[model samples]
Structures are given as C-alpha cells and as structure tokens.
Target chain A: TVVVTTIMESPYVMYKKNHEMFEGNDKYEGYCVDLASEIAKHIGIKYKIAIVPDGKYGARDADTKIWNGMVGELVYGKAEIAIAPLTITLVREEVIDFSKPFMSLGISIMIKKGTPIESAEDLAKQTEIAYGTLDSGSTKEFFRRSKIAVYEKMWTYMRSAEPSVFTRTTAEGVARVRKSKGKFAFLLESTMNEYTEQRKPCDTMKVGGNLDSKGYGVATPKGSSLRTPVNLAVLKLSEAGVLDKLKNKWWYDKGEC
Target chain B: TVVVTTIMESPYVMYKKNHEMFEGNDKYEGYCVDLASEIAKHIGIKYKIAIVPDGKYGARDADTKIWNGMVGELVYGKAEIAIAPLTITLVREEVIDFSKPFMSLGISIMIKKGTPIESAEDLAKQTEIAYGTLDSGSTKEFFRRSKIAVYEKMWTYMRSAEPSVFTRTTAEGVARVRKSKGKFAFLLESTMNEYTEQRKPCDTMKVGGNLDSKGYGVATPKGSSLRTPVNLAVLKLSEAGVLDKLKNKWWYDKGEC
Candidate 1:
C-alpha cells in the first residue's frame, strides 16, 4: 500500500458531497481521484490519498531552505507518490521524478465575463483592472522569475499594490474576481481557468493565448522505483484517451455553464 | 567546437537562397538556426551545424538495433547536440537527454482550405478522403502505438492504403494535401502545420484540436554536462519570450499569405 499526497483543489481533488459519511480514500472525489484509481488499476497497486497539511501545491522557502506542500511530502518521505495537478517544473524535476505530462496547461488569464482584458498585455497596460495569482504557486513563481518586459511590469505591480492582490487559494482568487465586479482578474493555470468558466454563475472567462505552455505531471519521489511504471501508465492512459475522458467528465460533462 | 546536428525543414532549418555562395553555418537560415545562435550565445559555446547524413529524424531499426538521423548523431557521439524540430518523446527520452520543452505542439490534422474534415474523428470515420502521416516520425509512431479506437482504426487504414499514403518528408505530405484537391489530409506536428498554413498558397488550414499535446526540446546525449546549462538556457529564453519572438519572426513576419 502506498500513501499518495494531494491537495484539496476543485475539480482536481475535492471532498465528496457526502464525504463525511465515507472512510479513508472514499472521502475524496474529483479528476485526480478518478485518475489515481485509474493509475492504480492499470499498474496493479493500492494507494491511499492524503491531503497535504499546508494546503499548498509545493514551494521552497528562501531562508529556511525547506520544501512545503505536496512536494514536501514526497521529498521527506511522507508519501510515495503525488497524484495532483502539480506542475512539472524545472526546479521540481530536479528534486522529484515526474511522469510525462498527463495534462497540458499554461498560465492564463481569468477575467469576469465582461471585463476589458483580452490578454496579459492588456492587463499590463491598464491600471484600472488589478490582477494577481495564487500567493504561493507556479503562477506567482512565473511572474517572479520572468524577465520579459510585460510580465516584469505586471510582477512589479503585483508585488507593490497597496492591497495585496495574491489569494491564499484558487477558490479565493475566483471569489475575488466574482466580488470585484470587473476590477480584479486572476492569473491561474489554463486548466482551472477553463474549469471555472464552465461552472455555475459562469461570470468568468479565460482570455488570450496562454502566457506560456507546460503540463501537469504525476510526481514521485526522486529515483523511486515507481517512476518507470508510473510513466508508462500515464503514456498508456494518454494514448487511450483516458486522461481526456477524465477531463471531460470533471470539467465539461459536469459543467454548470 | 561543438557539432550540432539538424534536419533541413522549412522555416526551421533551410538552405539560404544563395546557399551556394556561403559556407559552413552561413549557408543555412531559419527558426532553428536563429535558436542555435541564441542558445550558443547564452551559454557561451562555439558550435557548427551539420545536416544529418541519413536525412531521417532518429528511429531504431528493429533488427539492426541501430539509430539514424539527427538523434543517431548524438547517440553515436557524432554531434554534441541536436537543434531541430525533433520532438521530445518517451522512446527518444530513453536514449538522449532533452531540455524542458522550448516549444509546445501536438499531433494535428492539416487539410486543403475548403475540405469538409473537422477532426481526426472525421478522418477516421470516412475513407473518401485519403490521409497519412510522415513516415518514421512521432506522428506515425503515435498512431501505431495508440490504443484509442479512433487512432487505432486510423493506423489500420494508413498501413493498408493503396499506393502507400505515407510521405517521406513533411514537405511531401503538405504537397500531397495540396495536389489531392481536397481529397487528402496530412497528419503532422501542429507547429509545422501552423507554420505551413502561414506560408504562400495559404491553401491549407489546420483543423481540429491537436490529437495529442507534446513539445520539442533541445536534446543532448545521456549524461552530458551540457544538459543542465542547455535546460537553464531554454527556460531563460522561454521566460524572456525570446522563443515566442523567434517564432513570430519565422512564422508570421515571414508569412506570404
């Protein structure tokens, strides 16, 4: 039996409607839940899902030099695998193994349906609309690490805005967008942006081509024996359209829009 | 000097109009030529470009167990690196190291401008219009390996198509689509499809969402010291939007349509 670390993110991982009545793995449901089960079934392994205590995706602290969130779980051996919407980033790839991408995504803009924004450049050029990303995730890291002029300008604005623009979670960010009328735009992964747009109220829409392209990979501890088999399983699933089917089941078939 | 292996493909690597008047690296120009220069400048390396002898993107012979094309150049130590439109794939990943994707793409369908086909499913469900992929490349390999019913069925038709539907080069495949008068569709990487759509004639269009998503990476041989720096350089170039700029320079600015 393997312990799989995940996070509570809508559509990717979430508490079931009657989660309280369920026990152990039955407590969860979402894209990742179904994905974990598929991988387990294909590879003939048993895994239990556990949410990361910090509720963060994964980030390294500057001064403490410590990893946190789901990544930390694998780095410190609290889990054997991570089957979440964790991004396959260069920094993370150095510390853990990632199966080839199971789902492709990119940093994208999420705006209230009637907002004037059509692209990152639009957000960069305007001060009337304030924009921000989740406080500690790849979206923020991208802005912080970017050297492109438009993104650098956007990051400068985000870091020094009188009121913090960053949100603690994606749900909080979406809430801000919904509450701010059209004054606030959220920067998030394209997958979540698209998923949110299809949800009820349907007040948000993803605008512009993605700022950059990448993917979400199933992660495992560095040099783990599970790396090879897991990679194969993911490829097989991708080729068989299981990944696409799961995305449709969670994002579109269940769409409220 | 580092020997870089590449293939001659339109707008990626191509002979200069006055190629006969120039020598060595000066004889060629395209997106990849510019990319190689940028990577070299960023990493402070001296390198020369060599066209692959066999003119194939690397593939392993089932019986001989040998590699060919640009991939073979690196695998056999003939080139220090490969800068081409070569895809980053699982089979290739096993034999060589690749940088984080510098460009994102997926297998896609290309049809004559007025063709009725809208998706791979459309192509799969009919036999009136002939379709095929470039021989010995990832596009063909994807269909061969796919377990998905649509693609599995597609491979069956392609393998048995009379007169052999496969083309030896991407240029040839595009030509087939152009000459077939809307009766042929080409399966190719989206990057090339998009690039081709922008070129003269503008008589072809990419239809449907990509069949699958992947990326093209700058590759190095296994365990090469160049891997880390090249990876960092690709990321740096990506974050700075240099990759996008190069794409625009070659694909859009040069567009004849």
Candidate 2:
C-alpha cells in the first residue's frame, strides 16, 4: 500500500470549505489534492493519504543530527511517498528523492494595501515597516545565505530587529502583516504570496516580482518503488500542460482579489 | 499660414492607411492631426499643419550652440506652434515655451522575439546585441546626462560603440531592430515602444518599464501669444479625460501589433 504524506497549506493543501461536515479525504481539496489524484490515476495506484503530524516540511538539529517532520518520517520508512509544497534542496535530496519540480516559486513580499514600500530596496532603506519571514524555512535560509546586496542588507535588518520579527508559521507572518496595519511586511514563497492576495479582507497585495527563484517537488524515500512512476507522472502531466492549468484553476479562477 | 510644425512619426503623425486621396489637412490623419484639429476648434482659430522642415525634435550643436529642428523653427518664426510628440526639456525651455505636457513618455527598449535580454541592467552588462536611440532626442540626451549607475554604464557602452549606432528617426531605429535578427534593440520613448509592440510582424515586445519619467508638450516660440490658450486648452482636455480617450482610440483601437 502507498502511504502519501502531505501538509495543510492553502491552495497546495487545505480543508474544503464545508470540510467540518465531511469525512476522510473528502474533507480536503486544493492544488496538491488535484495533483495527488492526477498522479495516482496516471500511476494506477491506490494510496492512503495523511498530513505530516507535526506540520514542518522537515529539518535536522545541529547537535543531534537527527531528522524531524516529513523528512524524518520518510527517512525512517514511516511513509513511502511525500506530496506537498516540499522544496527541493540538496540536504533533503541526500536522504530522499524528489520528482522533477512540479511548480516554480520565489521569495516575495506581501504588504497591506497602501504600504509605501514598492520593492525590497525600499523596505531595506527604511525603518517604517518591519519585514520578516517564517523562522527556519527555506525563505529564511535564502536570506541568511544570500550574497546579493539587497538580500544581504535585508537579512541584516531582519536578524537584528527587536521584539522578534520572525514568525513560527506562514500564517503568523501573514497575520502580522494584516494586524500591524501596514507596519509589517511578510516575505514568503510566491505560491503563498499569490494565494493570500485572493483570500479574505483582500486588503493586502503582492508587490513587485519575486526576489529569488526555486521550485517545489513531489518527494519520496530514497529507492522507494514509487519514485520512477511518480517522476514520470509529473513529467507527463507537466509536458501536457496540466500543471499550468492546475495553477490557473487554483490561483486565478478562484481568485477574490 | 498659421505656421504650425510637427514631425512625421508612425502611429503619432503619419499617413492614414486607406486615406481618401485629398489635399491639405484632409490628406493626413493621426493622433497629432486629430489633437491639432481639436485644439484649433477649442481656440477658435484656422491653422495650417506642416511637418518641421528639418525633420528633427530639437537639439543644439555643441560647437555652434544653435538650436535646430522644431525648436529652431519656432525660434526663427517659421512655425508659431510645434505639435508633435516633442519632449519638454530645460534646454528647449530657454528658446521655446511649451504647453502643459500633452503626453507622458520615457526611455524603453524594443526587442525581437527570442531575445535573451530582460532588463536595462542585463543589457548594460552584455555586449552581444547593440542598442541605440534617435539622434538629437531626449532619449539619447538622457543616457548622455544620467548619473545613475546602470544608465551611466549603459551610456559608456553605447557612446563608444563603433559604426555610428544612433538613428535619425524612430522608424529607422525600429527598422534596424526588425532586420537585425535579435542583434539590435532600439531605446526610444515608451510611447513609441508600446505603439510598436502592437504593430505588424508581431515578433517584438517591450520587455521592461521605462528608464525615466518625462512628458511630451506642445511648443511655441518663447513669449509667443498662443502659449497661454494652448496650455489652458491642454489642461481642459486632460481634465475631461479626452487625451486618455484619444490615446485608446489611436494606440490600441487602431493598432495591429
């Protein structure tokens, strides 16, 4: 039996609007759900799905050097396949295999409507708006490791800001952007950047294009039998333009912004 | 003769495609022609439309320090009003008076399909595809006078380019781009860049926003009696949104790009 591991990120994966009254997988729907269904059909597999229990994509502790979250689960054979907005990274690749990127994304800024800032340079130069990213995510790591001047300067500002600008979750970062009344801007992946713009209150905007580019992939335990077919399904679907159509279907057709 | 002066530039001032054969003003129809007709009606005057005899926007020779083109025509009393897409600049202000700017424009790039170039910064750091602007025009002067690092670097590259890269007219520059097979790009007013994007062959696109912000104004000789009424008429039309409507009429509704 194929055990699929995922997460609860909007558009990528989220509870259906009337999910409370529904049961099983019918309670959830999103781009990742559609993707999972499509890939399953293409591979002709019957798979049982569940969310990663801890909600982290996965990370390793420095001193202990032990994996945690989805990567931990996959590495220990707790799950056979993983499908989420799981970013492709070298560290993760050492322990797990990933299909060809299913979607491209980049770090982007989300600001409340009427924020004076228009670009990263603008935010980096001013102290009026506090900007930050989700703590310990790829976005944070990008800033921490960036050599580009604008991003380097942004990292310096964010790392030193008092009262703790970093958030434990993307939701907390977005909530800060909304509750700070134009005083806080959140930096997250463009997938979420565009997703929130079409969500409630609709008083926020994704200004400017992404600062950096990367992609997300379907992941699996190394040498797992599902890797080849999953990779092939993603490539065939992408080649047939299903990925782009799915993005448009989820991002714009359901847009409220 | 009312002594009105303009230059023949496609999509702005040009021969109508199926124009009925006629003489005088009836033989010409375009954005400027229509603008001239409207302004003449509002000011209650009969006027004659004529192309600037030298076919230049206006520039002063460094060695002689004498203004030329439409500005010179006005300075020499050859034309009482210059009504082409004449950019208003401090140098021109010394010799001619201009109405409140009738149009906004800035320097932009025109590129053929499949070009690897994306931004001015990209073009500035490369040497493969040569780029230039119309001679004796604001775009050229902008590069020559800019203090910004990217533009300063671009200017350095363009100023020393061999075989005389500058063209005499927007059409010449655009023609060079079309014939160069991705080897040439023209940097001219964004107004023309966008107009050309919607033109035939459809293999070209405007890749970036303008490099600077400025506007085109109707011109008259310094201290001419017509300046006040012309300026006021422009303001009236602008306030009524007639200029925007006219832009949609000529640039989009009539475009083929």
Candidate 3:
C-alpha cells in the first residue's frame, strides 16, 4: 500500500555489503526499512521501495517532478515516505510534511588538526584561515544570502579562498583542510563531519556552532495520509529513549570500539 | 529469542497514544512500534516494553558503572538492548556494539530572532553578547572537554556572559533565547533545534556550526545475542530504504507543513 524511497547516507541509512534494491521483494533491513514496515502494519497493507542514490539524486527535478530525489518521489507519488538524511530547511519545507525530527544536525566547518583557527572569529579575522562551504548548498548559500550582520560580512571572505573557495562534497572540504596545512577550512553538515572526526587521528574536528539549525526527518508527500502513523512512530522512538540509543550505538559507540 | 529493552523515545521506540503518562508519546505510534511487533514475529518472542523517561530518569546505575539513560540500561545488562535516542559516541562504542545509526544529528545553537549578531564572531567580539550552553550534558561536556582552538576561545566568552550565563536544561535555554531578545544563545543537539524552530516565530534560529558529529542507534550489550538480529533488521531496513524514508518523513520533513 505504501512505497518507501531512500538514499545511501550512513547512520540514518546505509547499505550492508551489497545495496539491496527494494523493488518490493527485497525490502527490509535498515532503520528506515524497519520504519516502513511499521507504517505498513499500521496502514494495513504491504509496501515496496524505490531507491534513490543521494540527496541530490533523490530530489532531482523531473518534468512536473517524478521520483527524482526523496522529496520529489513523495511529491510525484513515486513513494509514500522518504527516510534518509533529508534535512529540514526553509526551501524543502514548503513541499512536504515532515514528522518531528527523528534526528537533528547542522552545517559545520571541518578544520584539520593544528589549524590556526580556534573559533569562528579567528577564521573571520584571519585571511590566513582560508575557508569555504559546500558550494551551491544550503550551508554555503546560508552565508551568502543571510540577513544576519556577521554572516553578511563573512560572506565576502568565503567568496575568495586562496586556492579557490568551493567544494562539491564535505569530503573534499575535509581533504582540503587536511592538505591545506591548517589553512583551509571546509564547511559541511555535521553528519559528515562527525563521521570523519571519529576516524583515526581525527585529522578534522567540527568547529563552532552549526552554521544553521538543520535536522534530519522522514519525508512524506505534503498532506499525505501516512503522516499521522509515521509521526506517531517517530514520537514513540523519541519517548522510548530509543532515538538516543540509536545515535549512540551508531555514531559515538562505534568510534570507541 | 532476543529481548530488546525499549524506552519511550520518539520515532524509534515507545508506547502509542495509549500511554498519556508520557508527555511526548502521541508521536510514538508508528515505525518503531511496527518494527518491534515485526521483530517479535520474526524472532517469535513476546517483546515487552517497560516505558522509561528519556532523560536521566531512564538510565540507572548498577555495580561498577552507572545506568539510567536507556544506553546505561543496556550497558549494565539490565536489558539486552536499549532502544532510545542514544548516539554512538566513541566512549560508548568502546563499551558496546550498536546496530547502526537509526538517525543522525550534530550539535547546533539556538538564538532568538532579530539578534544583531550572526556568526560566533559577534559573540566573541562583544562582551555583552550573553551565550552559553547546557551546563551539564554531553554537549556542555564536549565544549568543556575539547582542546580545540575555537572551543577554548568560546569558554572565555561563555564563562563571562554578564547576566550569569548557564542553563539548567535545553528547554530553559530555549526559553532564554525567546525572552533574552538577542542576548542568549542555547547550544544543543540539532534535533531540539529543528523541533523548536517549527514552533513558530520564537525569533530563535540556530547559528554557528555544530560542535560534534553523531547519530542514534539500536544499542545491544557488548557481544549480546541481539547484535546479529538487530544488524539483520537494520540491513533489511537499509535495503528497503527504511531510514531514508523515516529521516525524510519524520525529522527532515517537518518544516514544510
């Protein structure tokens, strides 16, 4: 009765060994996979899945909007729900109905170890602390288009990093931070930063408050019938204290082990 | 059959609307519930849930270690699994094995709207800018414990926030952000930020980059019998694109409607 769409982002959703195509038969495995099953139980029907690769891949704009990305899939009816690292931002909120945040995160700067910058001010004051954010993404554009006083000023510096000031992925920004010899700071969402920071030596660490108040959620078509059930499900997780347990188990717990 | 000790957390695990005693329980009626039911079906065990509050109340201390938060419950062997909003931190990872990230998030700040300041720079520059984080939580401890440059510098400002900076709870911090009129900034996980952001013109917007990276996971005791079943469940969900669906449906999708 319901179709779930997803992306391969970690913690929230990732493949085990080989990615299983959720074409109806082989659906059921990840957090979202289990989540969808719950929805089906409540909705009183069987469900299937349509896979989308990444956030961009899922949200792609097809003519009149087909299941391009997770958002599009819901809008276009390709799927009933999207459980991925879909962030709640001003732009996306207009088109969908997100439940309470299953998880939350924000944009942050990944600075390599020994970077001269200790705080946002240090980066703001020093031309030496070169920095850039995920180009064309909400994080970068947040600075470029924000009305806040400090952001308006910092936008100038961000526009011009010595070795160029834009990156496609958080990884590139992190790489630059590592190779820049403590000069370049890459800006990315905290999800990626946290994942990287846990890795050996933690060449990079997330610095400062997140650039924005973004959180992950399950995406459903705007005003879809499934909202109540899914929302209730999420609330249960939060209330049960399982949400925190899940976060600890996947993100922080693994690193220590 | 593996027993999964669950608490009442939103989106992941909890009793349904039937449990009004729980403040945030209305939302827990979906995915996690279904997953629990299904796990019982597949594993063929009557999975019983003992509702626990999400905060320090849920965790309990036993023997050489402490327990209370759902994470603690599992670690102390009070239960084989703690399904709650427990993030996978390196410290916990050392002591436990988590299924996978049920959800992901990072730390962010909540500031009142119309604040003259934007980036953390404004806070650092003005002595009057009263900014502080939760006094005794994972987030506060992270900032206090961090040796990073920005964290060190932030301590100086946070320590001297004129009107006696420091909050008893995240709710108190948000309340401060609402009443302070551009004077207070509350640092917390992104989930709370986005949740409150939707509460309407509180003039609170999360600023700065997140301080840490992490995700919630399904935690099982170290080498517990539940790991394989949990992992399999997660793998099934991933294949089914379950996480992608839930993140977008619950946490990521809230802003739009």
- DockQ, each predicted model: 0.43, 0.01, 0.02
Q: Give candidate 3's whole-model lDDT.
A: 0.63
lDDT: the better of candidates 1 and 3: 1
For model 2, the stretches where C-alpha displacement exceeds 4 angstroms are A18-23, B1-203, B206-257
Report the lDDT tens digits of candidate 3 across residue range A36-135: 5554665566766767644553333437554356777677777787776677554465577666567666667788877766556667776767778776
TM-score of chain A of each: 0.98, 0.94, 0.81
Q: After aligning candidate 1 to the native by TM-score, how far in Å is the CA of B215 from where it should be?
A: 1.6
Question: lDDT (0-100) at residue B76 of candidate 1?
Answer: 93
Clashing residue pairs in candidate 1 (N, C-alpha, C atoms within 3 angstroms): none
lDDT leader = 1
Task: Give the candidate number with the greatest DockQ.
Answer: 1
Considering summed lDDT, which 10 consecutive residues are worst modelled in model 2 chain B? B235-244
TM-score (2 decimals) of chain A in model 3: 0.81
* Candidate 3 local lDDT, residue B253: 69
Poorest stretch of ten by lDDT in candidate 2 chain A: A235-244
Score each candidate by Cα lDDT.
0.89, 0.82, 0.63
True contacts kept of each: 0.38, 0.00, 0.00
**Could you tell me every candidate's TM-score relative to the true structure?**
0.92, 0.52, 0.47
lDDT of 2 by residue, B1-257 (tens): 57778989876788766657777787787889989988898888788888887788888888887778888899888889988998866567657776656676667889998899999998988898998877778778778876667888988888899977899877788889999999998898889888888888888889887675556778989778887678667755654456766888989997785
- Candidate 2 vs candidate 3: the lDDT winner is 2
Candidate 3 chain B, poorest ten consecutive residues by summed lDDT:
B53-62
